[PDB]
C-alpha cells in the first residue's frame, strides 16, 4: 500500500501515449527510496 | 518465490510470514490472468 | 547474528523470537548506511 498509488486516469492514459511517442527531452525515474531489508521488500522487485 | 523462499530461510522467519508472501505472488497471477486477455487483444491494437 | 543464533539453539527457544532478534540486527544496518556518509564525510574534517 506504501507503493500502489490511487488509480489516476492522466496518468495512466499518459503512460501507454509514451510507449510509442518521441523522446526530445531525456526521461529520468521518480526515485524510489528502499533498502531492500525485509524479504517483503520484493514488491519493487515485482513493480519493475 | 524461489528467491524469496531462500531469502527468508536465511533470516529463518516464520512460516506464516513466508506464506502469506507467497499467496500473495500467486494472487498476482489471478489478477494478471484477468487483465491480460483485454491487453493482448484491445490494447496491442490500440500501440499498432 | 551466528553468536546469538547457537545462543538460541543450545536452549532451544522459538522460531520467531530468534527471527525478530535478527529482523532488529539488519534494523541497525540501514540506519548506520545511511548515516555512515555523515560521519566519514562531515565528522572525519571535524577531527582532522
Do not use: G
Not at chain 2, 15 to 40: G, M, P, Y
Request: aromatic letters at 6%.
Amino acid at each position: 500500500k506504501a507503493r500502489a498509488s490511487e488509480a489516476d486516469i492522466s496518468s495512466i492514459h499518459l503512460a501507454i501515449a509514451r510507449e510509442v511517442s518521441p523522446m526530445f527531452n531525456v526521461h529520468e525515474l521518480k526515485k524510489i527510496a528502499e533498502s531492500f531489508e525485509d524479504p517483503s521488500s520484493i514488491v519493487v522487485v515485482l513493480e519493475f | 518465490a524461489n528467491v524469496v523462499n531462500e531469502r527468508a530461510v536465511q533470516d529463518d522467519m516464520q512460516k506464516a510470514t513466508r506464506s502469506c508472501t507467497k499467496q500473495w505472488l500467486r494472487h498476482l497471477e489471478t489478477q494478471f490472468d484477468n487483465i491480460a486477455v483485454a491487453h493482448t487483444d484491445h490494447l496491442s491494437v490500440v500501440y499498432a
